């Protein structure tokens, strides 16, 4: 939601580009429905069983693993976590390259920023399809 | 829960009670013959696929919609021309009916030199230089893209490909075929951001040289101006010649332009009973340049009949799948499985945790006698327990006739549908094929019809019955058994085969002065991981936390044999046993074969980088099989 | 170079030389079909009279193409002529079907050459094919369809009396 | 300290000197020397870690090129 708030303040830069941001908000809706449905599944969870509770617990364990970006190399940039790590593929580096648009200095690269936006949208789509689990739960 | 061989009887009695050739004849009807991508009848055929999946009361079908750039010919059509210098003018030999997809829309002119197939070793046996010259080859045993890459290797600017009479027994001397030459799998035209700017791709397999199919009669008219006798090694006709004359040469003009089409991969999912998220992938190519009896009249047909039989065992008799079942009908598969790759670009490493087996319905029905298997090794012993109780169609004996079946496995090429699952996304994949010593004569031609296919094999229903039987036993063994029938001990033979390649060449290693102790430490870690996993299977339950976790750890073993040491955009092939690229192991084998001579092609620092990344990949995968940190 | 050449692309001359080869091939095929019937063990002299003609017309087709090609000023690069497909046509009806199939191949090649001439903006070559070669091949295909239909409705190749009466009355 | 070294390298400087100020570090000792690291990231930077000889550079880590 803070990333979406960082995006809504600078959607003027995205609409001078003339592109729609539909798949990122679709991944956000999938993520929020995944949280609501897994909370509803926590409403259908018992205490001292073996078959469903530890599976739900492992699905909550895997949330940290599926924020790692699959689109960059571990040997090139070993920090693949988009929230706390570093590298050009992360979301604060996307916000820095979006900060660089406001002037006519040569630090701003258009196509590299579009690459960062596309790979970050696909990473959030993959995380939304990872936490929600089954294809029945989308 | 039901009993196992009773469910085997259910499979065996629904296989014998379903017509198979009727769908193959139905796709060959006059309203459905051109189903090339982007057309009206291809969308109508996708509607028919959706209709047939809706007829059996499934769980959910939908479309996977993508907006892709393909390359279709213009009003100007392709031309192959004999040009002569001394009189300055020309002769058209062929305007072909078929075309090689995704070739460079340009015009080349050069001396024509004949090679056998288009491989490296057949180029190193030549008499005539290759650079700046067009090489005419024959299709066979490799893809079109490997021919184009070999022509890129020796500065060749054009490739002409003709079907011979010896390898392909076709009476039609003028039949043109279809081809694709993507160096890799997917869309070569991938600057994949939506927008009007024109960026280059440069990292997606663009053939920067033209390449175009020719027929047989125009090939003989080409050899009429060529000199130099072809070898008796190449096993050709009496027609064959090697190189054109002094002042004559060959001109090729390819005129393919862009086209923005929509592809619609039809997906149909069926739920299970216990495990909701994991599944076996059952996919099938669907479109065809021509009619497509075998190219499309087989994969779509077997997909629909497996949907029929599995919907029957769900709805009627009460078979219990442990996990879900999928059925995928693909678009843009003739180009090199573009739609499957673009589906797997969104699903690179977020699908191997759930989907764990690709079954290859494509090119499963091609002949009668030979049953050849090319597969991921984890599936192999499963295939072994498949080959022992499925009947041979005409002879009547068993399929498991050779106990040396796993060591002489011919490797998957570029032009198959299971190879991107094997080498790009890390899903285990199996390809089984009924065929003979001669290939299928109508792969990509206009005569891949129901008539010749039903005429050559009168027991096409029985051949499709045996192929659907091994596919259905794959599905039921993987989706009802309490364990997984996956063999991690064939990988002992795989890594020991790599160490066997190293032990015979250790003199060249001791010329470098290496103590290889950490590599044998990694192999010992792998061996102890296999032994301790076998001991854990000695104390694992069946119908119970731990069981699905052990099953997913067995699923992950093919995924850890990818290379995590390269970027996928530079190199989409990352699997060290089956894929391609310098970081892979056959590149290390050929680079070490370059070491035995003092050739300058041997790059020694690059070979050291290969060996270090390979040893680190072996260390990482051998530790990844161990799991918990106590297991060392 | 030439001196009369004007607005004449090289692909046009290529397709012209291809078409000249195809026409001489057709003339050779009709020569074989003609003197197949002159044998004693077939003995249909008016079939041989008919098929000895419609080879001279295709010979004139080839010569008219070559005259056209020397008008627009190229060269004439000509390949070999290949032997025909079959020799023993087994009847007189099946020979009419093979002649029908050959004329449809010639029509298909002329349509491809017209599309090539339209793509290159050559109105003279389009006009040449519209004036000379399209209408004659349509009439020839219709005539061979008439003869095939007559010999099919008369019950051939069962009773050769149909072949005899058809040879004496229609092609006499 | 490695961010100091890498950011000074990013403007193409040739040296990094790092001391302890009195205000932020209220240290009585003025002649004290401290210890740190100069790796931008974690893992072993000096990794030609194949079992072995020859002297290869790192080339896949991003080492500092100026002393500290």
B326 contacts B310 by C-beta, under 8 angstroms:
no
The Cβ-side half-sphere exposure at B348, using a 13 Å CA radius, reads 21
Helices within B388-459 (DSSP H only): 419-423, 450-456
Find residue B72's DSSP bridge partners: B257
Calculate helix-pair angle for C45-52, C161-169, nearest 10 degrees: 50
Size of interface B-C (CB pairs under 8 A): 47
- Asked if C77 lies within 8 A of B81 by C-beta distance, the reply is no
Phi, psi dihedrals of residue B227, rounded to the nearest 5°: -125, 170
Neighbours of chain D (3+ CB pairs under 8 A): A, B
Token pair belonging to A45: 């969870």
Calculate helix-pair angle for B460-480, B380-387, nearest 10 degrees: 130
User: Cβ neighbours of residue D61 under 8 Å, at least 6 residues apart?
Assistant: D41, D43, D45, D47
The Cβ-side half-sphere exposure at B374, using a 13 Å CA radius, reads 20
Size of interface A-D (CB pairs under 8 A): 6
Q: Which of D39, D41, D47 to mutate to test the interface with A (most CBs of A within 10 A)?
A: D41
C-alpha pair distances (Å), C84 with each of B47, B211, C28, C98: 46, 31, 7, 11
Alpha carbon of B618: minimum distance to chain D alpha carbons (Å) = 11
Phi, psi dihedrals of residue B582, rounded to the nearest 5°: -70, -35
- Asked if A134 lies within 8 A of B566 by C-beta distance, the reply is no
3-state secondary structure of B372: strand
Number of CB atoms found within 10 A of residue B69's CB: 15
B588 contacts B457 by C-beta, under 8 angstroms:
no
With touching defined as 3 or more inter-chain CB pairs under 8 Å, the answer for chains A and D is yes
Find residue B268's DSSP bridge partners: B61, B327
User: Cβ neighbours of residue C71 under 8 Å, at least 6 residues apart?
Assistant: C4
Helices within B388-489 (DSSP H only): 419-423, 450-456, 460-480
Q: Where are the domains of chain C?
A: 10-170
Alpha carbon of B595: minimum distance to chain D alpha carbons (Å) = 17
Alpha carbon of B497: minimum distance to chain D alpha carbons (Å) = 20
3-state secondary structure of A130: helix
- Asked if B199 lies within 8 A of A50 by C-beta distance, the reply is no
Strands (E), B48-166: 60-73, 79-84, 90-94, 100-101, 107-110, 112-114, 134-138, 158-162
B485 contacts B477 by C-beta, under 8 angstroms:
yes
Alpha carbon of C92: minimum distance to chain B alpha carbons (Å) = 24
Q: Which residues of B fall within a CB distance of 8 Å from C24?
A: none
C137 annotated to a ligand binding site = yes
The Cβ-side half-sphere exposure at A10, using a 13 Å CA radius, reads 15
Token pair belonging to B125: 């046996």
3-state secondary structure of B179: strand
With touching defined as 3 or more inter-chain CB pairs under 8 Å, the answer for chains A and C is no
3-state secondary structure of B143: coil
As to burial, measured by CB atoms within 10 angstroms (0-12 exposed, 13-18 middle, 19+ buried), residue B136 is buried
Residue corresponding to tokens 């979301």 = A91
C158 annotated to a ligand binding site = no
3-state secondary structure of B77: coil
Alpha carbon of A81: minimum distance to chain D alpha carbons (Å) = 13
Residue by residue, DSSP assigns B588-611 as: HHHHHHTTTS--TT--HHHHHHHH
B364 contacts B433 by C-beta, under 8 angstroms:
yes
Neighbours of chain A (3+ CB pairs under 8 A): B, D
Q: Which of B190, B567, B574, B616 to mutate to test the interface with A (most CBs of A within 10 A)?
A: B567
The conformation of residue B561, written as its DSSP 8-state character, comes to: G
Token pair belonging to B372: 């050849």
Alpha carbon of B612: minimum distance to chain D alpha carbons (Å) = 5
C69 annotated to a ligand binding site = no
As to burial, measured by CB atoms within 10 angstroms (0-12 exposed, 13-18 middle, 19+ buried), residue C107 is middle
Residues B112 and B245: their CA atoms lie apart, in Å, by: 9
Alpha carbon of D28: minimum distance to chain A alpha carbons (Å) = 36
Q: Which residue of B has its CA nearest to C112?
A: B95
- Asked if C115 lies within 8 A of B92 by C-beta distance, the reply is no
CA torsion B372→B378→B379→B380, rounded to 10°? Answer: 40
The conformation of residue D61, written as its DSSP 8-state character, comes to: S
Q: Which residues of B fall within a CB distance of 8 Å from D50?
A: 514, 518, 608, 611-612, 615-616
Size of interface A-B (CB pairs under 8 A): 54
B415 contacts B427 by C-beta, under 8 angstroms:
no
- Asked if C17 lies within 8 A of B91 by C-beta distance, the reply is yes
3-state secondary structure of B377: helix
Residues B469 and A30: their CA atoms lie apart, in Å, by: 39
User: Cβ neighbours of residue B172 under 8 Å, at least 6 residues apart?
Assistant: B216, B447
Residues B353 and A58: their CA atoms lie apart, in Å, by: 13
Pick from B345, B357, B337, B378: nearest CA to B427: B357
- Which experimental approach was used here? cryo-EM
- Asked if A78 lies within 8 A of D41 by C-beta distance, the reply is yes
Residue by residue, DSSP assigns B31-43 as: TSS---TTSHHHH
3-state secondary structure of D33: coil
Q: Which residues of A fall within a CB distance of 8 Å from B194?
A: 19
B583 contacts B574 by C-beta, under 8 angstroms:
yes
Domains of chain B are 1-74+257-490 (3.40.630.10), 77-254 (3.50.30.30), 491-631 (1.20.930.40)
Number of CB atoms found within 10 A of residue C63's CB: 13
Residue C107's H or E segment, with its range, is helix C93-119
C60 annotated to a ligand binding site = no
With touching defined as 3 or more inter-chain CB pairs under 8 Å, the answer for chains D and C is no
Phi, psi dihedrals of residue B386, rounded to the nearest 5°: -85, -35
- Asked if D51 lies within 8 A of B605 by C-beta distance, the reply is no
Token pair belonging to A74: 């571990």
CA torsion B237→B242→B248→B249, rounded to 10°? Answer: 100
CATH for C10-170, options being 3.40.980.10, 3.30.70.2860, 3.40.50.620, 1.20.1260.10? 1.20.1260.10
Please give the span between the terminal C-alpha atoms of chain A, in angstroms, as a whole number. Answer: 19
With touching defined as 3 or more inter-chain CB pairs under 8 Å, the answer for chains B and D is yes
Resolution (A): 3.9
Pick from B439, B620, B594, B593: nearest CA to B529: B620
Token pair belonging to B526: 């792998």
- Asked if C112 lies within 8 A of B95 by C-beta distance, the reply is yes
- Asked if A79 lies within 8 A of D41 by C-beta distance, the reply is yes
3-state secondary structure of B389: coil
Q: Which residue of A has its CA nearest to B194?
A: A19
Calculate helix-pair angle for C161-169, C134-153, nearest 10 degrees: 140
B338 contacts B330 by C-beta, under 8 angstroms:
no
Residues C96 and C106: their CA atoms lie apart, in Å, by: 15
**A22 — contact with chain B (CB < 8 Å)?**
no
D39 contacts D45 by C-beta, under 8 angstroms:
yes
Residue corresponding to tokens 């090489």 = B135
The conformation of residue B260, written as its DSSP 8-state character, comes to: E
A101 contacts A107 by C-beta, under 8 angstroms:
no
Q: Which residues of A fall within a CB distance of 8 Å from D42?
A: 78
Pick from B317, B52, B303, B332: nearest CA to B190: B332
User: Cβ neighbours of residue B457 under 8 Å, at least 6 residues apart?
Assistant: B367, B368, B463
Q: Which residue of B has its CA nearest to A135?
A: B277
Pick from C116, B539, B568: nearest CA to A89: B568
B47 preceded by a cis bond (ω within 30 of 0)? no
C58 preceded by a cis bond (ω within 30 of 0)? no
Residues B45 and B287: their CA atoms lie apart, in Å, by: 9
B interface with C, Cβ–Cβ < 8 A, is 75-77, 79, 81-82, 84, 87-93, 95, 221, 224, 253
**A78 — contact with chain D (CB < 8 Å)?**
yes
Q: Which residues of A fall within a CB distance of 8 Å from B324?
A: 134-135
- Asked if D41 lies within 8 A of A75 by C-beta distance, the reply is no
Q: Give me Rg for the CA atoms of chain A.
A: 18
Minimum-distance CB partner of B277 among A19, A70, A134: A134
Alpha carbon of B491: minimum distance to chain D alpha carbons (Å) = 22
Residue B259's H or E segment, with its range, is strand B256-270
Domains of chain A are 1-137 (1.20.930.40)
C61 annotated to a ligand binding site = yes
Longest dimension (CA), chain C: 62
3-state secondary structure of B615: helix
Q: Which residues of B fall within a CB distance of 8 Å from C79?
A: 91, 221, 224
Residue corresponding to tokens 């936390």 = B545
Token pair belonging to B382: 């499963």
Pick from B369, B406, B375, B392: nearest CA to B469: B392
B117 contacts B138 by C-beta, under 8 angstroms:
yes
- Asked if B87 lies within 8 A of C75 by C-beta distance, the reply is yes
**A29 — contact with chain D (CB < 8 Å)?**
no
Minimum-distance CB partner of B515 among D48, D51, D54: D51
Chain C 36-65, residues with CB within 8 Å of chain B CB atoms: none
User: Cβ neighbours of residue B602 under 8 Å, at least 6 residues apart?
Assistant: B591, B594, B595
Alpha carbon of B9: minimum distance to chain C alpha carbons (Å) = 54
Angle at the Cα of B292 from the Cα atoms of B287 and B298, rounded to 5 degrees: 90
Q: Give me the count of residues in chain C.
A: 172
Q: What is the 3-state secondary structure (H, E, C) of B299-324?
A: HHHHHHHHHHHHHHHHHHHCCCCCEE
Angle at the Cα of B510 from the Cα atoms of B509 and B513, rounded to 5 degrees: 100
C-alpha pair distances (Å), C140 with each of C24, C51, C104, C148, C152: 17, 13, 10, 12, 18
Longest dimension (CA), chain B: 85
Q: Which residues of D fall within a CB distance of 8 Å from B516?
A: 51
Residues B418 and B426: their CA atoms lie apart, in Å, by: 11
The conformation of residue B559, written as its DSSP 8-state character, comes to: G
As to burial, measured by CB atoms within 10 angstroms (0-12 exposed, 13-18 middle, 19+ buried), residue B314 is buried
């Amino acid at each position: 939601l803070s990333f979406v708030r960082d995006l809504n303040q600078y959607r003027a830069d995205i609409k001078e580009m003339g592109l729609s941001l539909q798949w990122l908000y679709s991944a956000r809706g999938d993520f929020f429905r995944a949280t609501s449905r897994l909370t509803t599944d926590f409403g259908n969870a018992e205490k001292t069983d073996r078959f469903v509770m530890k599976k739900l617990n492992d699905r909550v364990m895997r949330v940290e693993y599926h924020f790692l970006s699959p689109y960059v190399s571990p040997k090139e940039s070993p920090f693949r976590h988009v929230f706390w790590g570093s590298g050009s593929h992360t979301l604060p580096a996307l916000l820095e390259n979006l900060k660089l648009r406001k002037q006519n200095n040569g630090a701003f690269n258009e196509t590299l920023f579009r690459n960062q936006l596309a790979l970050a949208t696909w990473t959030i789509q993959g995380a939304a399809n990872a936490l929600s689990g089954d294809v029945w739960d989308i | 829960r039901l009993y196992w061989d009773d469910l085997k009887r259910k499979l065996s009695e629904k296989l014998d009670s379903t017509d198979f050739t009727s769908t193959i004849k139905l796709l060959n009807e006059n309203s459905y013959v051109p189903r090339e991508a982007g057309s009206q009848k291809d969308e109508n055929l996708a509607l028919y696929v959706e209709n047939q999946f809706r007829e059996f009361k499934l769980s959910k079908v939908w479309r996977d919609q993508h907006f892709v750039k393909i390359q279709v010919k213009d009003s100007a059509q392709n031309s192959v021309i004999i040009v002569d210098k001394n009189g300055r003018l020309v002769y058209l030999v062929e305007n072909p009916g078929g075309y090689v997809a995704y070739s460079k829309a340009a015009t080349v002119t050069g001396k024509l030199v004949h090679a056998n197939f288009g491989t490296k070793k057949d180029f190193e046996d030549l008499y005539t230089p290759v650079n700046g010259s067009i090489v005419i080859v024959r299709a066979g045993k490799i893809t079109f893209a490997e021919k184009v890459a070999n022509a890129e290797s020796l500065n060749a600017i054009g490739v002409l490909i003709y079907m011979d009479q010896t390898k392909f027994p076709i009476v039609n001397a003028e039949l043109s075929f279809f081809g694709h030459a993507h160096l890799g799998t997917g869309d070569p035209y991938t600057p994949g951001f939506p927008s009007t700017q024109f960026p280059p791709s440069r990292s997606s397999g663009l053939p920067n040289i033209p390449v175009q199919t020719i027929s047989r009669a125009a090939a003989e008219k080409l050899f009429g101006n060529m000199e130099g006798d072809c070898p008796s090694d190449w096993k050709t006709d009496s027609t064959c010649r090697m190189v054109t004359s002094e002042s004559k040469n060959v001109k090729l003009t390819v005129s393919n332009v862009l086209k923005e089409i929509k592809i619609l991969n039809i997906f149909g999912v069926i739920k299970g009973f216990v495990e909701p998220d994991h599944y076996v992938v059952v996919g099938a190519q669907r479109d065809a340049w021509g009619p497509g009896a075998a190219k499309s009249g087989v994969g779509t047909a077997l997909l629909l009949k497996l949907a029929q039989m599995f919907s029957d065992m769900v709805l009627k008799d009460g078979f219990q799948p442990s996990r879900s079942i999928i059925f995928a009908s693909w678009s843009a598969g003739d180009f090199g499985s573009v739609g499957a790759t673009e589906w797997l670009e969104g699903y690179l490493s977020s699908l191997h945790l759930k989907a764990f087996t690709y079954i290859n319905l494509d090119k499963a029905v091609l002949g009668t006698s030979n049953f050849k298997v090319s597969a991921s090794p984890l599936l192999y012993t499963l295939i072994e327990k498949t080959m022992q109780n499925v009947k041979h169609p005409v002879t009547g004996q068993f399929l498991y006739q050779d106990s040396n079946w796993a060591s002489k496995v011919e490797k998957l090429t570029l032009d198959n549908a299971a190879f991107p699952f094997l080498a790009y996304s890390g899903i285990p994949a199996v390809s089984f094929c009924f065929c003979e010593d001669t290939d299928y004569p109508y792969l990509g031609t206009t005569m891949d019809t129901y008539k010749e296919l039903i005429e050559r094999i009168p027991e096409l229903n029985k051949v499709a019955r045996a192929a659907a039987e091994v596919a259905g036993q794959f599905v039921i063994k993987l989706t009802h058994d309490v364990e997984l029938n996956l063999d991690y001990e064939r990988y002992n033979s795989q890594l020991l085969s790599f160490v066997r390649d190293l032990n015979q060449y250790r003199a060249d290693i001791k010329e470098m002065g290496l103590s290889l102790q950490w590599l044998y430490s990694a192999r010992g870690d792998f061996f102890r991981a296999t032994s301790r996993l076998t001991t854990d299977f000695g104390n694992a339950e069946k119908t119970d936390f731990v069981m699905k976790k052990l099953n997913d750890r067995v699923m992950r073993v093919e995924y850890h044999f990818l290379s995590p040491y390269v970027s996928p955009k530079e190199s989409p092939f990352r699997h060290v046993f089956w894929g391609s690229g310098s970081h892979t192991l056959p590149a290390l084998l050929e680079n070490l074969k370059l070491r035995k001579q003092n050739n300058g092609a041997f790059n020694e620092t690059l070979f050291r980088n290969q060996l270090a990344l390979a040893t680190w990949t072996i260390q990482g995968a051998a530790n990844a099989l161990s799991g918990d940190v106590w297991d060392i | 170079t030439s001196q009369v050449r004007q607005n004449y692309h090289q692909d046009s001359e290529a397709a012209i030389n291809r078409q000249i080869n195809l026409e001489l091939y057709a003339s050779y095929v009709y020569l074989s079909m003609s003197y197949y019937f002159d044998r004693d063990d077939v003995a249909l002299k008016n079939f041989a009279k008919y098929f000895l003609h419609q080879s001279h017309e295709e010979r004139e087709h080839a010569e008219k193409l070559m005259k056209l090609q020397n008008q627009r000023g190229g060269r004439i690069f000509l390949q070999d002529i290949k032997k025909p497909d079959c020799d023993d046509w087994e009847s007189g009806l099946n020979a009419m079907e093979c002649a029908l199939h050959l004329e449809k191949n010639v029509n298909q090649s002329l349509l491809e050459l017209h599309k090539l001439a339209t793509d290159k903006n050559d109105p003279h070559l389009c006009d040449f094919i519209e004036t000379h070669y399209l209408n004659e091949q349509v009439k020839a295909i219709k005539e061979l369809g008439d003869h095939v239909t007559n010999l099919r409705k008369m019950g051939a190749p069962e009773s050769g009396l149909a072949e005899y009466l058809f040879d004496k009355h229609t092609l006499g």
